[PDB]
Design a protein around this nucleic acid. Structure first.
Ligand SMILES: [K+]
Ligand SMILES: [K+]
Ligand SMILES: [K+]
Ligand SMILES: [K+]
Ligand SMILES: [Mg+2]
Ligand SMILES: [Mg+2]
Ligand SMILES: [Mg+2]
Ligand SMILES: [Mg+2]
Ligand SMILES: [Mg+2]
Ligand SMILES: [Mg+2]
Ligand SMILES: [Mg+2]
Ligand SMILES: [Mg+2]
Ligand SMILES: [Mg+2]
Ligand SMILES: [Mg+2]
Ligand SMILES: [Mg+2]
Ligand SMILES: [Mg+2]
Ligand SMILES: [Mg+2]
Ligand SMILES: [Mg+2]
Ligand SMILES: [Mg+2]
Ligand SMILES: [Mg+2]
Ligand SMILES: [Mg+2]
Ligand SMILES: [Mg+2]
Ligand SMILES: [Mg+2]
Ligand SMILES: [Mg+2]
Ligand SMILES: [Mg+2]
Ligand SMILES: [Mg+2]
Lengths: 110, 158, 116, 103, 44, 71
RNA sequence: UCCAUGGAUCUCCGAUCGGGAAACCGUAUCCAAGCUCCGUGGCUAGUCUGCGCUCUUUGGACUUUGAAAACUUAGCGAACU
RNA sequence: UAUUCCUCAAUGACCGAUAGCGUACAAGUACCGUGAGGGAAAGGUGAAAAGAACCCUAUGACGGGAGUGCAAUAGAGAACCU
RNA sequence: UCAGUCAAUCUACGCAGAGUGAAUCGGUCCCUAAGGAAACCCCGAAAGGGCUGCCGUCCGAUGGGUACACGAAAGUGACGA
């Protein structure tokens, strides 16, 4: 419905109604205005959206149905790539060597 | 049977929205406006010209019948109309006072006038949406600057 | 506040085998009881033998029992269905006899109506 | 914890200084052993404070700010500092000095 | 009747595998000839 | 998405298509060490910790609005 | 979209840190220096000093050369005919 | 002076789909062999897909009409010029 | 449509989607046999061949093992018909 009632329903598009519209991806110049905390929060918002989108594509193709608006997935993917590029830019410009190495480790850690 | 070793036209002197005359083929001697350019085939579509008849079988979604639509014409079969004389003419390249490429009429019997870039090109084919979707960030939230390198606002948790 | 210590990883350096730890020389110094013959082998309470073999014996015993139980269950279920069929056959016998009473009454009384 | 239980079952009530000391001990043990367990343990000790009706003072926020700043969680310390008026507490010099060093 | 090919994966890897070829000079020549011909399967 | 491969790649050994003592693995990161009795001790220092902030109250959304804004 | 230049990211074998059924497994190297944070110990207790790790920087310690057709120079060297 | 794993430009009383490289086409592939190794076949609708709506008879249109096209035995689905 | 010794509606056949859940099962891991290989050393036109030890390393089950690490002049594990 409006809000997901449990963590399972966050894998579903609760906002899908009237054709629903979706905006564009984030630009790097717009992400350069955001703090590290905001960029990490936006990363996890994009991650949950990407998980929901791949879940919807997997559910629909398992029943031989078309996945609508397939361009939503590369929009999220490219926005996440730009977030990591902006954070690595900030890591490179850090004058302290220890802080620069820690920022690079935070960005690239898996 | 696309049997020729035809190279692509790399820089087109024939644009969408241009006023042209067909100078070769079944519809020779007829004028029109370029609806669409098919770059991968070196072909264009002139609105209302070079009509074919398609026998489309109606499925559950579309409708059947025999439909009349435009077929593509080769880009060397059309020619830009001279804006003064009204006759087909070749296109030359002139650099302006600022240094911008413009198209001018070329050939013996032409005025040499500037062939203007069509105004339809600046219009978006997919218009922008009127209402933002439920997952679209409003632009005032996008512009909120929470990072500043000089004063160290928005640093990570090191 | 747990004071227990974590299990530690084994080291990878080579260790000496026990044959090379013995001192060189011709003599072996074996356990000796002064009135008894010298034993060739002196097992103690830790000398456990054939652990894999006993595990295999137990596995084979469990397999034999489980397959026997499966076989018995299948036989019992089929005999249950057979008993149900026997009861249904005995019921269908008396239903058949009563239906023949009805049909013979109908045919002989249709002939009686032909007689009236 | 056992002595606090014994004194509660003996007649004495347990106070704000003792809860501040338990909170500090819990935070230091978490930072030594497993620092990602720190937030649920802090939540449990604080929920034991508002279940027992024992209010927070400046020393509680000082303990929380000092322990969050030593694992470089500065944003949580600043958010906690901004909400000190809602529990009725007021910052002192130790809070300011710890936050300036952390910032 | 019993036929000549009796498959066993470990014997195949020990006789014709990549490191079995790398262990001898003749096997390294087999690999080099093999790549020079352009075979997709360098080793068996 | 379907993607073209070489037919020769079906001859690369996989534990699904091998004798039962062939082990390959899938480049998973180790979480501890093997013991010499055939067990495994998971060490929590080698376990991943995920630092994830709270997302409630956040204003930024996955997409940026495409509505006509200004010249 | 595309182009030019410069960047960020950049899985694995071949292959070289060790093992190996190629594309897999195991791997905080080791040791001097000087620096923020971290923790604990000790004085006569104030800009007091002395012990540590983890990770960061600059070095120096082990060792990793490495492919490639023909041509060249060498070693050994047939038989059919 | 030698050679071509290579690059750039050009030439041919050189070949033109059983020819020319083994390969004009996703070939050192398919296939054969435990392995070293051996090793194919297969080009062409039309200018443009306009690739035959609809009707009739068959289970089913590739059929017979209709229509497209200069031309339909030019009506094909790794294949339709003659 | 192909295949099936069919005129097949069916199928190990074509299209599409789905399915394999482990502290204990079987492996991985530890340990070695036959055997293989490095190192050192010996020998050899080259390539290579030998040697596995008096102090010696790494692999290799068809066998021995199942809730730390280190060490050992302790016992053993340990066996035919
Ligand atoms: K032309
Ligand atoms: K001779
Ligand atoms: K050929
Ligand atoms: K023809
Ligand atoms: Mg990455
Ligand atoms: Mg053409
Ligand atoms: Mg083969
Ligand atoms: Mg690929
Ligand atoms: Mg399998
Ligand atoms: Mg791996
Ligand atoms: Mg390696
Ligand atoms: Mg032919
Ligand atoms: Mg021919
Ligand atoms: Mg040929
Ligand atoms: Mg037809
Ligand atoms: Mg022709
Ligand atoms: Mg058949
Ligand atoms: Mg099937
Ligand atoms: Mg087991
Ligand atoms: Mg041996
Ligand atoms: Mg040997
Ligand atoms: Mg040797
Ligand atoms: Mg080796
Ligand atoms: Mg071993
Ligand atoms: Mg075994
Ligand atoms: Mg035995």
């Amino acid at each position: 419905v409006k809000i997901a009632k449990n963590p399972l329903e966050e894998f579903f598009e609760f906002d899908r109604s009237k054709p629903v519209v979706y905006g564009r991806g984030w630009k790097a110049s717009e992400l350069r205005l955001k703090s590290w905390d905001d960029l990490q929060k936006l990363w996890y918002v994009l991650l949950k959206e990407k998980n929901m989108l791949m879940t919807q594509r997997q559910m629909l193709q398992a029943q031989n149905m078309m996945f609508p608006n397939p361009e939503r997935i590369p929009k999220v993917r490219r926005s996440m790539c730009r977030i990591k590029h902006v954070l690595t830019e900030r890591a490179i410009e850090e004058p302290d060597p220890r802080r620069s190495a820690e920022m690079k480790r935070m960005v690239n850690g898996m | 049977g696309w049997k020729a070793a035809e190279k692509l036209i790399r820089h087109w002197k024939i644009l969408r929205g241009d006023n042209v005359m067909i100078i070769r083929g079944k519809d020779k001697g007829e004028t029109g406006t370029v609806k669409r350019v098919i770059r991968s085939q070196n072909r264009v579509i002139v609105e209302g010209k070079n009509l074919i008849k398609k026998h489309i079988k109606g499925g559950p979604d579309h409708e059947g019948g025999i439909f009349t639509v435009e077929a593509p014409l080769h880009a060397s079969n059309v020619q830009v109309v001279d804006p003064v004389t009204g006759r087909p003419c070749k296109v030359g390249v002139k650099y302006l006072e600022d240094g911008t490429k413009v198209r001018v009429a070329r050939g013996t019997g032409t005025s040499g006038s500037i062939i203007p870039r069509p105004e339809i090109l600046k219009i978006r084919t997919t218009p922008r949406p009127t209402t933002a979707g439920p997952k679209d960030t409003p632009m005032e939230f996008v512009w909120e600057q929470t990072y500043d390198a000089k004063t160290g606002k928005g640093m990570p948790d090191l | 506040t747990d004071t227990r210590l974590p299990k530690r990883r084994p080291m990878a350096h080579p260790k000496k085998k026990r044959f090379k730890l013995k001192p060189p020389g011709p003599y072996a110094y074996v356990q000796y009881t002064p009135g008894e013959p010298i034993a060739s082998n002196n097992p103690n309470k830790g000398s456990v033998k054939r652990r894999n073999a006993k595990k295999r014996i137990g596995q084979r015993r469990a397999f034999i029992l489980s397959e026997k139980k499966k076989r018995q269950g299948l036989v019992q279920e089929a005999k249950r269905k057979k008993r149900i069929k026997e009861v249904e056959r005995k019921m269908a016998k008396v239903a058949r006899e009563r239906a023949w009473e009805e049909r013979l009454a109908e045919l002989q009384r249709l002939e009686e109506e032909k007689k009236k | 914890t056992r002595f606090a239980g014994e004194m509660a079952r003996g007649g004495f009530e347990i106070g704000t200084l003792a809860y501040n000391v338990i909170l500090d001990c819990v935070c230091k043990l978490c930072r030594k052993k497993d620092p990602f367990r720190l937030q649920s343990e802090v939540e449990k000790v604080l929920l034991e404070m508002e279940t027992r009706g024992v209010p927070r003072n400046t020393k509680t926020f000082n303990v929380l700010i000092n322990n969050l700043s030593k694992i470089r969680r500065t944003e949580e310390a600043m958010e906690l500092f901004g909400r000190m008026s809602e529990w009725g507490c007021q910052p002192d010099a130790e809070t300011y000095l710890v936050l300036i060093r952390s910032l | 009747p019993k036929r000549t090919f009796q498959p066993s994966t470990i014997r195949r890897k020990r006789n014709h595998g990549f490191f079995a070829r790398k262990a001898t000079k003749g096997g390294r020549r087999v690999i080099a000839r093999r790549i020079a011909k352009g075979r997709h399967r360098v080793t068996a | 998405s379907f993607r073209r491969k070489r037919a020769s790649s079906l001859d690369i050994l996989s534990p699904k298509r091998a004798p039962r003592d062939f082990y390959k693995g899938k480049n998973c990161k180790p979480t501890g060490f093997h013991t010499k009795k055939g067990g495994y001790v998971v060490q929590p220092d080698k376990l991943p910790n995920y630092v994830i902030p709270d997302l409630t109250g956040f204003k930024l959304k996955p997409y940026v609005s495409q509505c006509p804004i200004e010249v």
